[PDB]
Amino acid sequence: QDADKLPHTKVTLVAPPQVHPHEQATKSGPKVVEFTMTIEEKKMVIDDKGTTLQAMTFNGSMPGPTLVVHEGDYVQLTLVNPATNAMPHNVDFHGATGALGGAKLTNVNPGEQATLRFKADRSGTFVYHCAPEGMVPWHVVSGMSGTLMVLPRDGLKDPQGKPLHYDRAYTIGEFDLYIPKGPDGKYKDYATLAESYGDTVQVMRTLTPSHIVFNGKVGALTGANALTAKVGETVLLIHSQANRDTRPHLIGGHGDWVWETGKFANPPQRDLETWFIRGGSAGAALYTFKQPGVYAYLNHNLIEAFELGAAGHIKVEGKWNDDLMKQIKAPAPIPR
Amino acid sequence: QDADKLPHTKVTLVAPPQVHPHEQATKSGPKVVEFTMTIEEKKMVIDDKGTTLQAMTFNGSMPGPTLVVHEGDYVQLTLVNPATNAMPHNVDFHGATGALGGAKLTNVNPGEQATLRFKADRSGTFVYHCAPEGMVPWHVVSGMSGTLMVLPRDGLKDPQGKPLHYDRAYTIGEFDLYIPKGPDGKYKDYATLAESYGDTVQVMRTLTPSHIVFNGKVGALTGANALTAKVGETVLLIHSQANRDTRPHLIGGHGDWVWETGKFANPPQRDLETWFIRGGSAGAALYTFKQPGVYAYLNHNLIEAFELGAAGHIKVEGKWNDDLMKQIKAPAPIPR
Amino acid sequence: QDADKLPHTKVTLVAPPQVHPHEQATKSGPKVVEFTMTIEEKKMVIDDKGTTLQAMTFNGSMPGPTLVVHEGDYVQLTLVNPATNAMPHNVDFHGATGALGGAKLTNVNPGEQATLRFKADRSGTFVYHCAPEGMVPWHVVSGMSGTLMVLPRDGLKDPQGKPLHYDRAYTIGEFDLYIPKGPDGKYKDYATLAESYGDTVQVMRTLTPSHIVFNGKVGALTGANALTAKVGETVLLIHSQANRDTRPHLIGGHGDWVWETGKFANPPQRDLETWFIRGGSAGAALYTFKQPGVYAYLNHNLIEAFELGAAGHIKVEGKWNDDLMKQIKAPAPIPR
Ligand SMILES: [Cu+]
Ligand SMILES: [Cu+]
Ligand SMILES: [Cu+]
């Protein structure tokens, strides 16, 4: 179990909402899984009205990519902070033990890189996020978080120990954004990242987000960018919120099996309408589609979903099943 | 299990906080249970100071009535939108599968009605609410939600599979209201429903309710309108919140058995002081009264309960039991 | 089980964050455990900038002391309200049955005392707080709450019934404070408790705390006042929030076994990154330290922790373990 004498393997990370290829149950024994992530500070457009955010990301996306390993593996991360950035960064992995989650061993100034190794000895979906001393909330709310999924080597199980399997996995990061507004009643635009700080902390202190989005922007997962699946497929929906609570719900569907605290050694709950993801954590739900059509996947504080942005869509192909639901009488004049 | 060849039965719905008569465990096999609900848009008085709300309700009450069926039954709902209303409505049942919870098949303009059938294949208390495309939050926060309770055909069970039974069931809907205030520091009064929209969405976006009430108004379940029970009775308290989290607690009592996510195939938790109902869901608690006296049942954010309105009372008859609690020394001068 | 014929014993309460000596599993049968608490109304400094609060406390601290008994014991509390106070007080124990948690039997004006006895028949960590008719929220948010821990007579157990034991127990109370600000943008200072009321209720109604602190002040458990432990020790962290939700997390660690609803007859959850304490309740987590260094224990709404005050530290002695985490490459220039 010395880590230095185990096999090493390299994973190529992909952008949300996809998750990189991986095996659910594995026969292999423990390995050292190597990942690389580059920090990118950039100004991004977060709504359809042209509102901008001075953002900070892991690999250029919000959320950062999901990293997948099995319980007992060692995560070996190379964190790269290019010289074109302006701030220092680091990473705090909630799935790791010690040193402020690794934050103490990964302080990197623009133009520096560092490599950390930690044992992933606890299964579940865990948040990771940047956490620079004295500036923690700002880097997290500007976009620096993602998920680490540690699968049990034997794959997911139901409460009676029966095997659960998914066909497809999607990762949704939910971000509460605090964009300052000026007297016009218009959101401010900033020339540089550093210039947005002072105003942004004042909005943060009110505890009221201006926008709450899935994966980086209002409408990121709606319409043309909907998630896709087919009747009969089992999807795993990973949902992370590194700062604020959320309450995910699939309209027209359910959470067949849900780990809302996100830790796979505990028995999941079944048949949930709406589940709860505590700020600072990631959770996961399984659902097998039974009806075709468009579904909405959203935070069920409906002001947060429809007014502030926390809603996405899943487009499902297949044949309607009239036993589950059937219009007996279409809308028509009442009888007189 | 074709639904069209099953027996059909009609249920007469009653107003909250009562729940219509039903059997807990049943010997009968699956049926098609027919319900009818009429939408009523009306201006209502929501506090003791004369504040009004331009409300929207299912059957004239907030919340709408609780509908009860057994797992495996088919719900057959006729939704009626009279010509005296002004808006279009529909219904989204969280206990249903497909078509945005039924919302896609029940779009009814004033003067129209529609009938939907869906299989209630998952046990638990589920929210239902109106959800018209582009106006979802407004119809929900104006009062359109209630609960569907799907009991397991064998009745409720504890974690070891031992039977649980209740003598009486009560249904509480908890509503976060967003009533606009003008410069006077007085709540606005609107001539029509449509006129309240613009101002109401501005209050909604602040995420801060002006009032949070049980069943339609401050004091709906207090004093003279308290709930009632007797020492030795087991009550089932159903609590729904279609938009915002809440944390119910009975002062002087406990949740003997609680399904806070509301789904009866999962084991309940025992001895809770305070439980958590996620916005967009309904949950249920069982309690057997052991002491007489007045109890308060409230959201335990005590500002939300005592300042904003989310508190009610339960008046219990019976004999005091000095073993459970006893005043040893009444209040008196300290000794000098 | 008559209480008057059982043995009586007196406990000497200590200030948070310590907890008074007690046995986990006990051979003794039920007893009447006598406690005394004195109310102290005082002006306290709650931050490092000199902000004051007109506070109200049980025994001069926030939170009040933790009282520990075993399931089946009888709690016998003498509540003392000295003549130097200005307000009436009482106590509501969530672990008690009847009479509004005991509040009805303990109304004490300045210069009076009362003694209440109640049977602690349900195991778990329970909140207790003051609750005077018509002034409930104000006494609770000004500081009057603490925890009652009722241990199972056989000690704590894991989900398979295997014994769990802790070496050390710490109690953290988390307080959402509502301190009024005047036009200067400076917090108001009040000559008397009664004078702070009117302004304080106006801030309360916005639902936005000015400060959220652990044990009475920003920095109460940081730096020099950190909690302490050693690698190999198992700590029990009791966390109470009598009014508002919170989401505790240990940076660099986990919740090995957590009862987030706080009731020990239910199976705990394992490997949590972040857990959830519902406003109006207390919960408990166990953790065995595996790495030395400084840990932060905080509410993982990172604005509430770092901007508003809800963060503390745990300083752990011992030897680093390179298998769990190891810096492979310290921060250095990227390669060119
Ligand atoms: Cu950062
Ligand atoms: Cu409607
Ligand atoms: Cu008090």
Automatic annotation (TrEMBL), chains A, B, C:
Binding locations of Zn(2+) 2: E34
InterPro entries reported in the protein's UniProt record: Cu-oxidase-like_N, Cu-oxidase_2nd, Cu-oxidase_fam, Cupredoxin, NO2-reductase_Cu
GO molecular function, a single term: copper ion binding
Binding site for Zn(2+) 8: E307
Residues annotated for Zn(2+) 3 binding in this entry: H70, D73
Description of how the protein assembles with itself and partners: Homotrimer.
Annotated positions binding Zn(2+) 4: H89, C130
Residue sites binding Cu(2+) 2 per the record: D92, H94, H129, H300
Swiss-Prot/TrEMBL cofactor(s): Cu(2+); FAD; Cu(+)
Subcellular location per the Swiss-Prot or TrEMBL entry: Periplasm
Family note: Belongs to the multicopper oxidase family.
Residues bound to Zn(2+) 9: H313
Residues engaged in binding Zn(2+) 7: E195
Residues at which Zn(2+) 6 binds: H165, D167
Name the UniProt record assigns to this protein: Copper-containing nitrite reductase
Species whose genome carries this gene: Alcaligenes xylosoxydans xylosoxydans
Domain of life of the organism encoding this protein: Bacteria
EC number(s) reported in the record: 1.7.2.1
UniProt: Zn(2+) 1 binding residues: H8
